[model samples]
Target chain A: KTVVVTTILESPYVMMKKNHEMLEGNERYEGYCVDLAAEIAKHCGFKYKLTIVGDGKYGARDADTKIWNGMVGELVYGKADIAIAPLTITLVREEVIDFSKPFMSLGISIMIKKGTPIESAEDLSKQTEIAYGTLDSGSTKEFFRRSKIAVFDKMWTYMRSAEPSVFVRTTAEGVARVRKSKGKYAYLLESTMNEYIEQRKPCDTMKVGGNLDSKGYGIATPKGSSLGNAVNLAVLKLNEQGLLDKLKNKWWYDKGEC
Target chain B: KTVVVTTILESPYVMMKKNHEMLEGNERYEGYCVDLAAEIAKHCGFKYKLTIVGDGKYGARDADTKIWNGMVGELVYGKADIAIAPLTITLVREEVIDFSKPFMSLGISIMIKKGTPIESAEDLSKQTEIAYGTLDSGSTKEFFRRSKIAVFDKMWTYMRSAEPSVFVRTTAEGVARVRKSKGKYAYLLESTMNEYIEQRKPCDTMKVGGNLDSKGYGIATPKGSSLGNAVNLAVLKLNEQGLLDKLKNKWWYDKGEC
Candidate 1:
C-alpha cells in the first residue's frame, strides 16, 4: 500500500513550485522535505503520496474538548500513515503518537528587526515598551502557556490578555508584523524559520540571544504504527550520513540571497 | 522493585564524591546524572540503585564478535534495568535497546589548546603537524569510522593508522594529551565534555569551530522494558518544565571556575 505522508506547506521545508499548477502528483511540491520524503521512502522501501495536512495547523490538543487537531489528528484518526513535517516533539503529543529520533535540531528563538533593543528573552520580558507574541496554536505559543519559567510564564500572561491580540495565525504573519512594526513588536519563533528569514530578500530581521530551549523535530507516526521503527531508524541513518545537514544547507543557504 | 540503573562514572555526569569512601550506596555518586536520576525516579515513582558499568567504556559493539559493551551491554544482557549515564543515542545502540527522548543535546566538536591555530575540522583534516583523535570505542570514533563524508572519512583513516595510537582509552586521557601536547595535538569529543573542561581550572583549552555533527544523550532501557515509556515521558516533562535546562546550568555553569 502507498503510504499517506501528511505534511505542512511551510517554506523551505515544503512549498509549491513556480509551475506547480501545471504539475501533477508529487512534482507539484519541491523543498527540503519533498526531497526528504523521497529519501525516506527509498530507504524504507515503500511507496508514498505527499498530502498537505488538513486544517493546516501543526498538531495541538484542544484545551477543553480533549481532541487533537492538524497532522497529529490525521495520524490518530488514520487519515495519514506518517507525518513528514517540522512538527515538534513534545510530551503532550508523544503520549498520542510516536516520534522518530530527531532528524533536525531546533529551538524556540526570538526574531526581531535588525536594530531592536531586545537581546534576550529576559530583555523582552523585563519591559513592556516593546510588545511580542508567538504564532498561535503552535509549540512556541504552547511553550509559553505551559511554562513554569518566570520569564516565559510572564510573557504568556501578557500575550493571553494583550489588547489587539498579539498572537498571529501563521509564522508569515508574525514575520510580517516584525518587519512592519518598526521595532515596536518582536516575534517569537523557532530558530530554523528565524534564520531562514534572516537570509531572505528584505532581510531586516535577526535571530538574537541563545535559543530559549533546545529540542528536535522528528518524523511522527501514530502510536505502534508498523512504519514507526523503519522511519525512526531511517532518520538516524540519514542524520549520521550528514544528509539532514546537507538538506538544510541546500534549502536555507545554497538558495539564499543574503 | 528497585530499578537497577547501569551508568558510567564520567566527570560532571557521574562521579565519586570526594568523600565517596565515607558514603554509602547512591550517596557515593553525585553529578548531573545523579540529580537527574533522582528527578526521574521521583517523576516515575520508582526506587533505583546506580551501579557503574563493569567496563569503563561507553557502549559499542565489537566488529567481529558483535557483542555489545559498556552500559549498553548491561541493558542488553539484562544486567541492569536502565542506563542514565551520558550514553549517546545512536542507531547501532537503538537497534539493541530503547532510549528515552534525549535529556540533553550535544555534538561532536573540536577541542584545542588555546592558540592552537586550528579553526575547524577541515583545517585539522588538511594538516598532519597537529595530531588529532577521539576517544576509542565510542560514538565519536564510530562516527568517523562510519561516516561517508570525505573530510571525516579521511580523518578516520589517518587516526586508525597513526603512529603511537591517536585513540585514547578515555576522554580524560584524550584531554590530557591535548594539554601536554603543547598545541601539537587536538582532541575531538562531545561538545558537552569540551565545554565542561573549558570552565575548569587551568582553562588552557577552548572549543573551536561549529560542531561537526549534532546529537544528544538519552536514558537507555532494555528493549520493550515497561520503564521505557515512563522514563521517556519524564524526560519530556522535565525538559518542558525547564528542569533540564536548570540541571544543565547547575552543573555546567554554576560550578564553573573560569
Candidate 2:
C-alpha cells in the first residue's frame, strides 16, 4: 500500500522541478523535507506517494469561512496519511491533530526589503514609516499576538489592525511583497524560510534581528494515528546519528537555492 | 540607601572568606556574582550590600517545612532588592519573582564519578542498576520532573520515587555523593557547576553526556520592582559586549575552581 504524503512547495523544503513534466514523483521530489520523508519511509519500511498541497497558503483557521487550507486540511480530512512540510506545531493545532517530536527547531524572524533601515525587529517596532505583517494564521503572527515580551507586544498592536492587503497568505507571498513593495513593507516569518529565501534567485530580501521566540516544526499526522510513534522515534534516531544536520546541509547549502 | 542583594555561596558564584574573622558581608564577597552585583549597582546607580542566603539550596518549596529558601525566599518576603546568583528562570519561580532577560545560558548536564560505567544521561536512563539524582530545587531537577521527552521522562520517574536518602540538598552535596558512592551514583547539575567540579583541585568527576535541555540564568528581582527594567537592560548590554562570556571563563575555567 502506498502511503500518501502531503507536502508544500517552499524553497529549501520543496520546489517544483524545472523539468517536472519529464519526471515521476519519486524522481522530482527533492529538498530537505523530501529527503527526510524518503529516509523516514526507508526506516519505517513503507512506500509513499508525495503530493503537493493545492493551496499556496500554510494551514490556517479562516475567520470568515471557518475553514483550513494547505497540508493541515489534507491530514485533518484524511486526504493524506502524513505531512512532512515545515509545518509548525502549535497549541491550537495540537487540539485537533498529533505532531511527532520536532524534526527542526527554529524561531520567528523578520525579512526586510534589502537596504531597509531596519536592522532588527526592535527597529520595526519603533517606526511606522514601513509596514510589517506575518503569514496569515501562521506561528509568526501568533507569536506576536501571544507574546509577553515588550517589543512583540507593541508589534502585535499594530499587526492586528493592519490593512487586509498588508497581511500575506504565505511566507513566499510575504517575501515577494517585501521585494516588490521596495522598502515600504517587511514580513515576519520562520528563520528557516527567511534563510532559504535569502539564498534564492533575485534575493531582494534579508533576514534581520534575533529570533522573536522559540518553536519547532514537526511531522504532522491525523489524531490517534499509530504512525506518530514510529515517525517520532525515527526523527530522534536520525537526530542522534547526525543525519538531520547532514541532510540540512545537503539540501540547503550544498544544493544551492531551491 | 543601600540596596540589599541576595546571593548564594556556590563556588564560582560565591565562596567563603580566606580569613574568616576579617570577612563580613561586603568584605567576604568575591567571584562572578560579586562582580556582577557591583556592575549592576554601578549601572543602576545604587549602593548595595551582598548578603548570602541563609541556606545554600537553590529556592524550593519545602514539602515538610512549607518554606522557600535561598534567593527565592528573600525576594518573596521583600528582604532583598535583587538576587545576583547562578539562579535559573523557571515557571514555578517566575510565579513568585520576576527575572530579567537571561544573564547566562547553560544546559542541564550529567556528572559521573571517575571510571563510571555510564557516559551520558542516556546511559543512566537505560539502566536501573546505576542510580542518579538532581540537586533538589534547581533547574536540573525541574527539567527531569517536567520533561515529556523519553530518557528524561523515564529518569524522572526513577528519581522522584527513589529512597529519601537518594536526593541531595545542594549541587555540592550531589557531586560529593557521586564522588563517594563510586559508579553506583551519578549527579545531574547545571553545565556551569559540572564544569566547575570537573576542574576542581581533587577532580574526581567528569561532565558526561550532552546537556539534556537548554536554559538560562537570570537576574531575579521581586515581582513588579522598578529595578527589573534597569537590570534587564544591563544584562542585554553586557551580553552584546561579550562581557558575560568573559566573566564565565574568568570565574570557571581560568580561576581554577574555588
Candidate 3:
C-alpha cells in the first residue's frame, strides 16, 4: 500500500529535470521538500509516490474561471493522500483540510522590480506612487484581507478596489508583470519564494521590508487521514535530528543558480 | 495618595520587628518581598502601606469552617490592594483572584525527617505504612488534586483519604510534623520554602525526590484590580535586573538561621 503525495516545482522545494525521460522519483528529482517527504515515508512505515501538480499556479478559487490549481486542487479532489510542499496554511484551506504543526514560519514580503523606489512595507503603506498587489487568493493577500491592525488593513482596502488587471494569478506571473511594468507595479509574495528568486541569475526582483504578519507552512492532508499523526511526529523527529536544517542548506545554500 | 498593600511574615518575604512596639510601615520591617513591593510601587507612582495580614496563617481555605484565611482572604474581601510575598499561585485561587505573571518558578518537593526511608513519590505511593501530606489548601495540595498523570495522582488519592488529624494546616506545621515523626512522616511543600528551612538552625529536614511539577508564585491582586498590569510588569523587570537573585542570596545565604 503506497501513499500518493502531491507537491510543487518551487525552487529549493522541487525542481524539474532539464532532460525529462531519463529521471526517476528519488534520483531524477530532489529538493528540501522532497527529502522531507521521503523522511516522513520512512518513519511512518509507508511507501509513497511523489507527483508534481500539473498547474504552475498555487491552489486558488479563481474569480473569473472558477478553477482550482496545484496541490490544493489535488487534495480537494481526493487525488493525493498528502501534500508536503511549502503549502501555506490558511483559514479557507483549513476548513477543507487539516494541517500538521508548522514546519516553517514566514510572512508576506514584497517583490519589487529591481531599482524600484520602495524599501519597506511602511513606505508602500503610505503612498500610491507605485501600484502594488498580491497573488489572488494566496496567503499573502489573505493576510492583508484579515488583518485588523496597521498598514495591512490599509493595503487590503486599496487592493480590493484596484483594477482587475492589477492582480496576478501566480507569483511567477506577478514577478513577470513587475519586470514588464518597469517599476510601476510590485508583487507581494511569501518570503521563502521571494528569497529564492533574489538569489537566482538575471534576478530582476528584490524583496523589501520585513514581513507584514506571520504565518506558517504545514504538511497538509484531508481531515481524518490515518497517516496524519505519523507524518506529524516524523516532521518533529526530523527537526530534532537536524535533518530539516541539513536539507534547507542542501537546497537553498548549495544548489542556487549563480 | 497611598497604595494600600498586603504582606505576610514568611521569613524570606518579610521579617518581624525584634521589638513589637517599634512596628511601622516600610520601617522596622524589611525583607526581599518588602523591597520588591516598594520598588514596584515607586516605579508605578504609588505611595503604599505595607500591612501584614491579620491572620498568621498563609492563604488557605478551611475545610470544616468553609472560610478563607490570610492575605488571600484580605484580597478577596477588599481589605488590601495587592499581595507581595512567596505566595504560590494555584488553579483554585486563580478562579477568584488574579496573579501577576509568575515572579518565581518553583517545584513541589517533599521534606523528610533525616534518615527517612522514602526517597521518591514512587515509594510513598506504593505504601501507606509511613503517612504523608501537603499543607492544606496550598499549591502543593492543589497540584496533586489537579494532576492527571504520574505518581502525583496516586499520592493525591492517598492524601485525600488520610485521617483529618494527619493533615497539616501550615507549612511550619507540616515541617514540624516531619521533624517530630522522624522517618515515619513526610511533608510536601514548595522548593523555595524547603530550601529556606533546610538552611535554618538544626536543619533536621531534607528534601527528597525530584520535584512533582513546575509552577510559580506571583504577586496577586483582587480580580479586576487596577494595579495588576503595573505589578506584573514590575516583577518581570525585577527579574531581568537580577534584583530578585540578589535578594534571595541576601536572605537565604548570608543571614539565614543555618
Residue A95 error, candidate 3, Å: 34
Write down the TM-score for model 1: 0.99
Candidate 3: stretches off by over 4 Å: A1-258, B57-69
Residue pairs in collision within model 2? none
Residues A65-167, model 1: lDDT tens digits:
8788999999998999999989999998999999998888899999999899999999998999899999889788999998888888999999899998999
- Of 1 and 2, the candidate ahead on DockQ is 1
lDDT agreement of model 3 with the native: 0.76
Highest DockQ against the true fold, candidate: 1
Considering TM-score, where higher is better, how would the candidates rank from best to worst? 1, 2, 3
> Model 2: residues >4 Å from true position, as ranges?
A148-150, A201-204, A255-258, B1-258
Best by TM-score: 1
> lDDT per residue, candidate 1, B1-258, as tens digits?
999999888889998999999999999999999999999999999999999999898899888888999999999999999999899999999899999988898999999999999999999999999999999888999999998899998999999999989999889999999999999999999999999999987999999999998889999999999999999999999998989999888889998999
| Model 1 bad stretches (over 4 Å) | none
Report DockQ per prediction, comma-separated.
0.82, 0.04, 0.02
Number of the top candidate by lDDT?
Answer: 1
TM-scores vs. true structure, each candidate: 0.99, 0.54, 0.50
